[PDB]
């Protein structure tokens, strides 16, 4: 019931998070570009991995994934702003951290709901994704001179 | 630049095309699934390649690529409808053919405009992408018992 | 952990039979789609072979004694085998695989439950991972057959 | 002297060159459900055919013979018949033509095997044997696609 | 080619039983040398599976109908299985594999002869290559056991 | 998550000392089977390092402070070390690896239990995956030693 | 677009004949330098094959009907074939390859001009890439023969 | 710069000098970001080397004679070298690489126009490809420096 | 003798075990701009430290020695001093600390070289020389990042 | 019962050992135009010859035999003759001597093929046949380099 | 053996005989440990073959004339070969490999000293690298045999 | 000293590299198809010595020559205009002369570094000398000659 619901919510949020990463990848300027620009590609690959896995779990459960930009934008809780070259490197990384914290919380909610329903395959998908996102939070926060502060 | 304008048109349309390919990938049902489902993955990778290359040619030119779903939806001439499992395999492939035919005509436009403005680097990007997309139209149309009808 | 051991051994038996059935599909397949589905069966057989080895060896690790003869496989399995027949349609063969896989998924579910109850978390995860991938196949097979997964 | 082993090897060169042309035609002119699988499958078959061609030709050279090596020689010596490319041939009909080409090659390789066996050319004999074995396995597979027994 | 088809099919059943025995050995092995012989059993199995797939699909190719159920395998195989037993020594396990391999080599020799007589040169080659490799393994296993190959 | 944090750090100390013990065995090993077990220790060491990095990083991720000095490892670990001795047999070296592994598996179970109770599901999976692998090695080592795994 | 189509088809026929000539060279080559030049013809044939595939398929893609019989290749090609002869010198062989390659290079230049005029830029690019590599081979072959490229 | 041969030869001398300058930067680099930018200079030099080989051998294919001595490179290049200095900062090193790339992109434009007017399409393509990647590097280099590409 | 070669090899065993522990600490406690490049760089260094550790200890074994092989032995014999991990240390302080360890290792390896050279143990001699070469390259690179000369 | 197959396998062991030694000499003492292609080509020939040696030797072991396994045994049993290395043998001569060795090996392999066939040893028979195939192909290519037909 | 060329040639003869001995060991081996030690002989032979090629070619490079006939090898080598014998135990086979390696290590020390005395530092390095790896093998072989390396 | 010969090697290796490029480009004659790519192999090996010896210089606290002018003023190798009408045999002879020079430079590097006790620099020269001298044998053999080091 609600496992399906949280899976679809992730499809929308992951689709918006991918667009944001792409913006950061494109509009980035400042010392650290040469390391953080390609890093955003590893992030988007990882984000797309969850996206594909979660929609197909949803298809497998007899659901209907969001599959249009209108659905993604309307249903996602993340918001987007116009690309701006003037944003600082640190600010871009902080934006990525924010997105990631949101996803880790969305994945937590996914774990709980699927746990309570006994959909253990879905539970695991959410657990694996959360683990990696949290490790990423640690490293970005470290780059930014901060504790992960989960 | 009109070259900048078309590169950005391509960013939006390729974003939408990518979304439509995902939908086709997810909602596909019928004989041929097993060959056409992972084939949508190869198309999406290729579309992603154009997306990043066209966007970064645009950045290189001093432009500012569309980088929010809002901008993609508003600027794209591609139309998205809700996902639907009861569409035929042959109708899904016809929809990909439509999208590709539009992309090939957009890339021709981009070729034209860049050729008129002496931007040969951009001219080449459009030409490589059109070539490959036109090859895919031939193959899709052959699967459908049809000539490419370019 | 008596019941976890017992369900690991059940899987050993059923996987062994599933493997045989998939091999029969592979060999006896005729019809449009052969060229895609014939090697597909090899992929499924490799994946089934991996559950078999992992489950059998978890059973050993736990102090069990896995079924290890064809006669044990055949009599302990709940899956039924019929003589190979070239005339079965592609579509019927795919449905036959779906039926086998639905059985395996339900058995892996019982494995999940039994082991969760006894607190054997390792066996739990083994069944959970196998169940995820079999269910994914069921979606794909059903989609080829023009149907919803109907799990 | 291996007169007939040499002769069947050159018959093979001619027949394999024409077979290659036919597969290329099937590859290009194919249309219908199953295109996406059978189209690249034709490249695999061509690659295999090309391997036989190069091996059988260079065994012939090795034996002191002179392989056919012009289109005119290929066409005039081959027993395979070519027709104009046509997009309105069905998939099942294209696969059926590949099967008849393959049945021919398999019968030709059986003749290569027997002739080389009788003349004591065991190397040539093994070449024809390996080629026959794979062509016959393809015939099984293609025939299966077409809902048929291999009927070797 | 009635006889070739027959011995190809006998090979399918015997290979399937050989595979199951190799799996018992893999699983139930205990004693010094486990760490080398346990993965070695995987290699033998992959090779046995290769013969199985190849001989079965030669049979189909000839117009035959491969055995394709466990019941058929057990009933048609000349190999006998017993319950797995951890108390068997490494020596005894390896000796058991040797006797399976000797049986298979002899069956492949019969395969070679019958296909030779019937003029089925492709089947003939399949049995010959398999026989070559099995015989090599017998040498090595025998050498491990301190013995001549004694073919 | 104070206790999950605590058992993660316990594991950092214990894995560090387990690592050092594996090095001793690798170096001081003598006897029949050296050539197989000497490199096998490298594979165990690599796997141990894997758990170590992952566990310490999970701890850093949770806002903890991993033990990171030989002093900390050696005082906090429950594993005891002794001077290297070439005169130990192969079989006793292997039995010492087994004791280390049984310790780690028990510790990984405590880690699973605790983390389950604080609802730290990520840390929980880490202990479960590591426990599954170590228990499998125990089976294998015991088999070499002619014994049941006896977990 | 009628002529881009005609030149792509001309190239289908000419590449088919060029391929055949390279094979003759490969087979009948004798003399010092056989050992590098014999497998070099294989590289050239693979390259001629790549153009053949790309140009026939671009033609298909534009609504054309590629030549696809040996009769069609032979009658439309401007390249002439003679019987293989082992007595031809290495250097005469390489000269014959140079003459084939110069013809192809001129054909690709006409390909380029015609496609350029009709606005078929994709076809245009295909000719230009092929012309570029064929001209580099011309340079290299001529350098072997102690000569300037002389394009 | 009279023609394609002329501008290709100019490219040969300028690329050789750009190669040397990139080497200088790689060696004398000091400051935060060394660990990224030091090996990045390798990638640039490798790419530069690529253009060098391509253009020189386009020039040889066309009947020309590439500069092939340091004297020729120094005297014909429009780039200016200075003595290596460790006290140049990372940001100044990168700005200098940008300056070299800006020069090369402009050379490549000239080569494009000249070859386009002469109808040497192959040479045209060579300049176009090189220019594309060089201009992309200026974007990235400029972004590291907090600036727009400013082509 | 080869008493002194054996002794320096074992000193390296202890110092490399401690160096390895220090690099792990830097790897984990690292915080600040540059983390993303330097954190995985610590892995590369540890891998190279462990290659040295494995080679020298086993040269020792090969020579008839008994390498140190307990955490107590490493801590008591090493001249390197360890302190508690601390996330407050800046990136540039962490790098400086790695430079100290490396300078110490390179000096030790010189000592290893001189001693093995004076003893005629040319195999052991080469091992120190190879390790010394790579460590000193790392010092140059680390110093460069810190805007300094190698100052060997 | 398999005495004749065993004897020819062992003959091959001795001959192959000596062939490997002749090829090494060719590799080492070669001088003249074409050195750069033919020098490494002798390594490929030697690896191939080593493959036949190991395979034929362990076929002999598999059949109950005792392979020759000493230089003395290889010299005494081989029918190939060795001469002192000489830098002034020309390239054409070096290649002609390889052809000589290869012609001898192909004829030895034909003998092994025949004997094993007569004894019903079909495994041994196929080993010789595959080796013969490959060596005869080498004779074609070497002769072609030399401007000659293979003259098998 | 009065110079570097003379000791290089001595190594050619001795490595040739060592190679022959290792093949005998590989072939005539029987007993527990066969499966590990039979392929290990292959690795030792590849290594010995690499010294042989490097030392012989160094000798050529120095103006020398390497032994290159079995007669030369056998008459110049100090190693003695005996007839193959299957009843030699595995430990006896490994003990013989150790004796050969001890001889080789001593030869390489002599090559090291001689080339050092002459200032042929390239030859010196070759003997030093070979010596190091042979000594490491002696350690590992002796360890299998439950012994110190005793160099 | 070691620093000094390290830098001389930077200069000479740069010029050797440029000479090898010329041989690569201007080559004509039977054997082109073998020798033209061999030049790339040599060029890569030279570039590897350049990088190693230069960074050893940097590592010892010196300042590598890093402009074409310094390369050319300091190298003892002579450069001539490219010429398509040189025989292959003549091409390979010029390469031999360059490598014989480099080999002798590396012996000087070896001798000086051993004297100075800079063992790391010593091995770098020893490794490069070994490979260059092996190339000399092979080139000479192609030329029907003994290596004559
Ligand atoms: Ca049917
Ligand atoms: Ca027991
Ligand atoms: Ca025994
Ligand atoms: Ca002992
Ligand atoms: Ca002639
Ligand atoms: Ca001569
Ligand atoms: Ca004895
Ligand atoms: Cl700008
Ligand atoms: Cl022991
Ligand atoms: Cl000639
Ligand atoms: Cl000569
Ligand atoms: Cl000792
Ligand atoms: Cl000399
Ligand atoms: Ni997907
Ligand atoms: Ni990008
Ligand atoms: Ni297993
Ligand atoms: Ni060929
Ligand atoms: Ni199969
Ligand atoms: Ni880490
Ligand atoms: Ni194609
Ligand atoms: Ni080049
Ligand atoms: Ni080790
Ligand atoms: Ni062997
Ligand atoms: Ni060699
Ligand atoms: Ni460098």
From Swiss-Prot, chains C, E, F, G, H, K:
Fe cation 2 binds at residue 57. Disulfide bonds: none annotated. One of its GO terms (biological process) is intracellular iron ion homeostasis. It catalyses: 2 Fe(2+) + H2O2 + 2 H(+) = 2 Fe(3+) + 2 H2O. Changing residue 53 to A: Abolishes the iron incorporation. GO terms for cellular component: cytoplasm. Changing residue 21 to L: In strain: 849. Changing residue 82 to A: In strain: KU5. It holds the Pfam family Ferritin. The keyword Oxidoreductase applies. The keyword Oxidoreductase applies. It comes from the Bacteria. Its EC number is 1.16.-.-. One of its GO terms (molecular function) is ferric iron binding. It is found in: Cytoplasm. Fe cation 1 binds at residues 26, 53, 57. Keywords: Cytoplasm, Iron, Iron storage, Metal-binding, Oxidoreductase. Its main location: cytoplasm. Protects DNA from oxidative damage by sequestering intracellular Fe(2+) ion and storing it in the form of Fe(3+) oxyhydroxide mineral. One hydrogen peroxide oxidizes two Fe(2+) ions, which prevents hydroxyl radical production by the Fenton reaction. It binds and incorporates Fe(2+) iron. Is responsible for hydrogen peroxide resistance. Does not bind DNA. Homododecamer. The 12 subunits form a hollow sphere into which the mineral iron core can probably be deposited. Can store up to 480 Fe(3+). 12 di-nuclear ferroxidase centers are located at the interfaces between subunits related by 2-fold symmetry axes. Belongs to the Dps family. This is DNA protection during starvation protein. It comes from Streptococcus suis.
Curated annotation (Swiss-Prot), chains D, I, J:
Keywords: Cytoplasm, Iron, Iron storage, Metal-binding, Oxidoreductase. It catalyses: 2 Fe(2+) + H2O2 + 2 H(+) = 2 Fe(3+) + 2 H2O. It is an enzyme of class 1 (oxidoreductase). Changing residue 151 to G: In strain: KU5. Its EC number is 1.16.-.-. Changing residue 58 to D: Decreases the iron incorporation considerably. Changing residue 83 to A: In strain: KU5. Changing residue 126 to A: No major effects. Fe cation 1 binds at residues 27, 54, 58. One of its GO terms (molecular function) is ferric iron binding. Changing residue 90 to M: In strain: 6407 and 825. Changing residue 54 to A: Abolishes the iron incorporation. Fe cation 2 binds at residue 58. Changing residue 22 to L: In strain: 849. Changing residue 134 to N: In strain: 836. Pfam families: Ferritin (PF00210). GO terms for cellular component: cytoplasm. GO terms for biological process: intracellular iron ion homeostasis. It is found in: Cytoplasm. Protects DNA from oxidative damage by sequestering intracellular Fe(2+) ion and storing it in the form of Fe(3+) oxyhydroxide mineral. One hydrogen peroxide oxidizes two Fe(2+) ions, which prevents hydroxyl radical production by the Fenton reaction. It binds and incorporates Fe(2+) iron. Is responsible for hydrogen peroxide resistance. Does not bind DNA. Belongs to the Dps family. 12 di-nuclear ferroxidase centers are located at the interfaces between subunits related by 2-fold symmetry axes. This is DNA protection during starvation protein. It comes from Streptococcus suis. The lineage of its organism: Bacteria, Bacillati, Bacillota, Bacilli, Lactobacillales. The gene is dps.
